[PDB]
Amino acid sequence: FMPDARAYWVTSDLIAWNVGELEAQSVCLYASRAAAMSLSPSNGGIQGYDSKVELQPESAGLPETVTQKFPFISSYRAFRVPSSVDVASLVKCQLVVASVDVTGLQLPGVLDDMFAYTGPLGAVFSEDSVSLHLWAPTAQGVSVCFFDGPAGPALETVQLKESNGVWSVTGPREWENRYYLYEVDVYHPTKAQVLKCLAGDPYARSLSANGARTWLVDINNETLKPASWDELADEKPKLDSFSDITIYELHIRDFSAHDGTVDSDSRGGFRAFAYQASAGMEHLRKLSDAGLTHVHLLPSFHFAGVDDIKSNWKFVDECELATFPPGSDMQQAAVVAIQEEDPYNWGYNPVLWGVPKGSYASDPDGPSRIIEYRQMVQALNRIGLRVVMDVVYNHLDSSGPCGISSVLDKIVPGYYVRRDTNGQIENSAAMNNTASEHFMVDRLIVDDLLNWAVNYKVDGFRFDLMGHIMKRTMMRAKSALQSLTTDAHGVDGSKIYLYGAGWDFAEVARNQRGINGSQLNMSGTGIGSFNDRIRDAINGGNPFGNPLQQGFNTGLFLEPNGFYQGNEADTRRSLATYADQIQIGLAGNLRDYVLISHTGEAKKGSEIHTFDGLPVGYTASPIETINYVSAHDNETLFDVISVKTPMILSVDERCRINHLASSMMALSQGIPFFHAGDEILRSKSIDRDSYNSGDWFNKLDFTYETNNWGVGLPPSEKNEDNWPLMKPRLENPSFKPAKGHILAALDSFVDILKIRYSSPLFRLSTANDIKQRVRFHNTGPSLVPGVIVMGIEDARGESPEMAQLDTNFSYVVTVFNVCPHEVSMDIPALASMGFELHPVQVNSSDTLVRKSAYEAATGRFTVPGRTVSVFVEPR
Numbered sequence: 017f018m019p020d021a022r023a024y025w026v027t028s029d030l031i032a033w034n035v036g037e038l039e040a041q042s043v044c045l046y047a048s049r050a051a052a053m054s055l056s057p058s059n060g061g062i063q064g065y066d067s068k069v070e071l072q073p074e075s076a077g078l079p080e081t082v083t084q085k086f087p088f089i090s091s092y093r094a095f096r097v098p099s100s101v102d103v104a105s106l107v108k109c110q111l112v113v114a115s116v117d118v119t120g121l122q123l124p125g126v127l128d129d130m131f132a133y134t135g136p137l138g139a140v141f142s143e144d145s146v147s148l149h150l151w152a153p154t155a156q157g158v159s160v161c162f163f164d165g166p167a168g169p170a171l172e173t174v175q176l177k178e179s180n181g182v183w184s185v186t187g188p189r190e191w192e193n194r195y196y197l198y199e200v201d202v203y204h205p206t207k208a209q210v211l212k213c214l215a216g217d218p219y220a221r222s223l224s225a226n227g228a229r230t231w232l233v234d235i236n237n238e239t240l241k242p243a244s245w246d247e248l249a250d251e252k253p254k255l256d257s258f259s260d261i262t263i264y265e266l267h268i269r270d271f272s273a274h275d276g277t278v279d280s281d282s283r284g285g286f287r288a289f290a291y292q293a294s295a296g297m298e299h300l301r302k303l304s305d306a307g308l309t310h311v312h313l314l315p316s317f318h319f320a321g322v323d324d325i326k327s328n329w330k331f332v333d334e335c336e337l338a339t340f341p342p343g344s345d346m347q348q349a350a351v352v353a354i355q356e357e358d359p360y361n362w363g364y365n366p367v368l369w370g371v372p373k374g375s376y377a378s379d380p381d382g383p384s385r386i387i388e389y390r391q392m393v394q395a396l397n398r399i400g401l402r403v404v405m406d407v408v409y410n411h412l413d414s415s416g417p418c419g420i421s422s423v424l425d426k427i428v429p430g431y432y433v434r435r436d437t438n439g440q441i442e443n444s445a446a447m448n449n450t451a452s453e454h455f456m457v458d459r460l461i462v463d464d465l466l467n468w469a470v471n472y473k474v475d476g477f478r479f480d481l482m483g484h485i486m487k488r489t490m491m492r493a494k495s496a497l498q499s500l501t502t503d504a505h506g507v508d509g510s511k512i513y514l515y516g517a518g519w520d521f522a523e524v525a526r527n528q529r530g531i532n533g534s535q536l537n538m539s540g541t542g543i544g545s546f547n548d549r550i551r552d553a554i555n556g557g558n559p560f561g562n563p564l565q566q567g568f569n570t571g572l573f574l575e576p577n578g579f580y581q582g583n584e585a586d587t588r589r590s591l592a593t594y595a596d597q598i599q600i601g602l603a604g605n606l607r608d609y610v611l612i613s614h615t616g617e618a619k620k621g622s623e624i625h626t627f628d629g630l631p632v633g634y635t636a637s638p639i640e641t642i643n644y645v646s647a648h649d650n651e652t653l654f655d656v657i658s659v660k661t662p663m664i665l666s667v668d669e670r671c672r673i674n675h676l677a678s679s680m681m682a683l684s685q686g687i688p689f690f691h692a693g694d695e696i697l698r699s700k701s702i703d704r705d706s707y708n709s710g711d712w713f714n715k716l717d718f719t720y721e722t723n724n725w726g727v728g729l730p731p732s733e734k735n736e737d738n739w740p741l742m743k744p745r746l747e748n749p750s751f752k753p754a755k756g757h758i759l760a761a762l763d764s765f766v767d768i769l770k771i772r773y774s775s776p777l778f779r780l781s782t783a784n785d786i787k788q789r790v791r792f793h794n795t796g797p798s799l800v801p802g803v804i805v806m807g808i809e810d811a812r813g814e815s816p817e818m819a820q821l822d823t824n825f826s827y828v829v830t831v832f833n834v835c836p837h838e839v840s841m842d843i844p845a846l847a848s849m850g851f852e853l854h855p856v857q858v859n860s861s862d863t864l865v866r867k868s869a870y871e872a873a874t875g876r877f878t879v880p881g882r883t884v885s886v887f888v889e890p891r
């Protein structure tokens with residue numbers, strides 16, 4: 017007996033099932049505590065039930081609270097559960113409804129309706145006691161098993177007692193620092209059995225290696241605090257406004273795995289950040305000094321895919337691999353052979369959200385993972401950088417009753433995970449999608465954010481697959497986080513910044529599970545989202561399409577690569593269309609910003625469309641826009657440029673193209689986002705998805721001797737289809753930059769950041785300011801192809817119609833020239849003004865940009881090939 021689950025128990029007194037009018041006259045609910053039911057032979061009824069009860073059809077249908085919470089079942093027929101039913105008892109049983117047509121029940125609705133709980137969860141410490149609280153309303157029994165030590169035998173089991181769906185027990189203070197697991201007896205739909213499950217605590221704050229046991233630690237214990245921890249708020253980098261944010265996206269292992277200036281034993285993890293004089297930390301300091309404000313760290317909570325036990329780690333022979341040819345498939349074969357047992361994974365495989373990853377700690381048992389995480393945050397803050405966590409609330413690594421990697425779904429099966437209309441777990445996020453639409457999932461997400469903000473003094477959060485998270489969850493979290501104060505909680509919540517990837521697809525599209533955290537839905541929330549429009553317009557095509565499809569900054573029309581993309585008029589128009597999209601992005605990607613489009617017609621950002629016919633500009637404020645051309649996913653900036661541009665371009669030319677891309681981000685309105693390595697030409701040898709490609713393909717070289725281009729074809733699983741285009745490029749010596757190119761890229765990246773932070777005009781705080789002050793000057797059907805001219809006005813003259821934002825400059829004009837030749841852009845509207853080359857560029861180590869000039873009589877800005885030139889009018 018293994019029924020599916022097409023019916024829903026939505027409230028205490030209502031069941032929803034999508035059956036006909038006649039079938040609805042003979043529906044009954046059946047329960048068995050021992051899960052002993054079966055179909056009778058004859059198939060004319062259900063057998064082996066403890067109880068059977070008729071469900072009368074509810075003529076009215078489902079009420080508004082239900083259909084609002086579960087829109088996708090809004091047309092289902094409703095069935096009344098009689099008051100005689102003991103609902104608390106039945107939800108602990110195997111349940112079916114039947115009329116022959118038999119099916120199980122999806123219980124989250126009723127579980128929330130009856131057992132939504134706002135009291136203490138996890139471990140609570142008092143002077144004389146420790147208490148444990150676990151929400152498990154469908155469980156038949158819960159005990160706790162204590163171990164002395166991470167590896168020793170069970171010393172004691174203690175029974176918990178349930179009240180209102182929550183199991184609790186109180187013990188003596190000596191329980192502190194024991195290890196434990198819950199023994200949970202609960203009905204698992206996937207096995208149609210009541211099973212004894214050994215599960216960690218969803219509210220865990222520490223763990224033994226691999227989360228095998230939960231450490232009963234008091235997170236407020238003084239010995240877990242680095243020196244001066246409680247004074248960190250006072251030491252944190254000032255942040256006057258979210259409009260001043262720039263973001264640098266970095267993986268913890270990539271940072272220090274190859275860094276010879278860090279002690280061998282401390283490479284790859286949290287402790288590497290404590291080495292202030294390391295090549296890695298000096299690099300971050302250099303960026304921080306230039307203006308960089310935030311470092312976004314890839315997943316650093318307890319995730320699966322890396323063993324916490326370091327003695328199990330495997331490594332390639334780097335000497336041997338370095339001997340292989342640049343376009344060989346031997347390197348990736350060697351990497352792939354041990355990729356399941358190496359120290360490496362991006363970490364998008366969540367197990368327990370509230371605990372630091374053990375593999376990044378010096379010792380995965382005991383306190384090191386806590387103290388060292390704090391030491392990392394403190395160290396970054398002390399070189400002027402705020403810390404953002406990549407949070408992955410949208411899915412779980414594992415589900416079901418078995419395995420070290422399943423926790424949430426062991427305890428309350430079928431509740432923390434989202435399911436389809438047959439009861440099967442939804443997998444669009446990767447696998448085991450969460451259901452933040454359910455009350456205790458929403459609670460756990462918000463509680464977890466608060467844990468990181470308060471216990472670890474984390475400064476911001478990037479939400480992975482934010483479109484899989486309910487908007488209500490996002491906003492409840494935002495308000496909870498930003499109301500934290502130093503007096504009450506030791507952190508200034510007003511400065512905590514939230515952003516995410518609001519992709520809208522699969523089961524959450526069209527608000528089918530509720531209003532989800534999509535790009536369009538988060539407009540007006542003040543929560544940032546990644547602008548994929550500017551990314552794709554600059555680079556060309558998209559990460560799923562033909563890799564050779566060119567864009568504004570990879571030679572579309574201007575420098576064709578030989579891949580057929582239409583006639584000359586078609587490519588010229590496509591280039592101009594991408595330029596429109598970029599300019600909307602450069603002005604904060606706003607709904608209402610008015611641009612003269614490539615046809616000459618004035619259009620709002622929302623009126624310029626993507627291929628799906630959706631607005632390019634979709635935000636209400638520049639702080640809702642995260643502008644980027646690169647991130648951990650897909651090809652690195654250096655790699656996408658190396659693929660899309662004409663093969664005959666020199667590496668020197670490509671280096672200028674890299675700078676153009678990062679400069680478009682760095683001088684944009686909204687919040688610029690950089691992938692770690694943009695600034696040093698980082699390559700993964702064209703790996704399109706390097707999550708499991710090891711240290712070999714993900715190398716971050718802070719000696720600057722290499723950029724990791726030409727270290728073999730990348731791993732076959734994600735890349736083999738494109739090996740034919742990769743091989744000749746990786747093999748060509750002219751594609752590979754030397755140290756000189758890498759250092760040059762870094763110097764110009766530093767300079768463009770200095771420029772951003774030299775004027776408040778690049779960082780306007782509201783849409784009104786952008787609409788009033790930002791103008792583009794190379795527009796319409798006769799625009800000069802390959803040039804964007806962006807002017808930003810400040811108060812000038814006597815009694816001006818705007819506030820003076822800039823004490824040094826009354827006007828800024830930025831010319832982005834992607835043409836492989838000098839251009840002269842005449843802007844007679846800006847004639848007879850006091851424009852000069854920005855002082856940073858006058859003193860640039862790049863000789864080419866110094867040649868940029870302005871002619872007053874004509875308003876002519878002369879800009880060399882493949883250059884971004886910034887002109888200022890001094891006060």
Ligand SMILES: OC[C@H]1O[C@H](OC[C@H]2O[C@H](O[C@H]3[C@H](O)[C@@H](O)[C@@H](O[C@H]4[C@H](O)[C@@H](O)[C@@H](OC[C@H]5O[C@H](O[C@H]6[C@H](O)[C@@H](O)[C@@H](O[C@H]7[C@H](O)[C@@H](O)[C@@H](O)O[C@@H]7CO)O[C@@H]6CO)[C@H](O)[C@@H](O)[C@@H]5O)O[C@@H]4CO)O[C@@H]3CO)[C@H](O)[C@@H](O)[C@@H]2O)[C@H](O)[C@@H](O)[C@@H]1O
Nearest residue numbers: 321364365445446481519521548559560628649650705707
């Ligand atoms: O074999 C069992 C196996 O089990 C374990 O492994 C589990 C899984 O591991 C691997 O999965 C991992 C991925 O490989 C990793 O890349 C990583 O993926 C996550 C990313 O890091 C996250 O950032 C995020 O990314 C999702 C998605 O976002 C982006 O795509 C956007 C795009 O940018 C937008 O423009 C837009 O595009 C659309 C466009 O707008 C439309 O017009 C139209 O064209 O359609 C476009 C979309 O089609 O929207 C898209 C999104 O729709 C980004 O560009 C893209 O690259 C990215 O994919 O979330 C990612 C998913 O989690 O982490 C994964 C999990 O670790 C394997 O690949 C899986 O198969 C495997 O199951 C265990 O570890 C193993 O040991 C074990 O063997």
Ligand SMILES: [Ca+2]
Nearest residue numbers: 355356360361
């Ligand atoms: Ca791996």
Ligand SMILES: [Cl-]
Nearest residue numbers: 341343344345
């Ligand atoms: Cl070869």
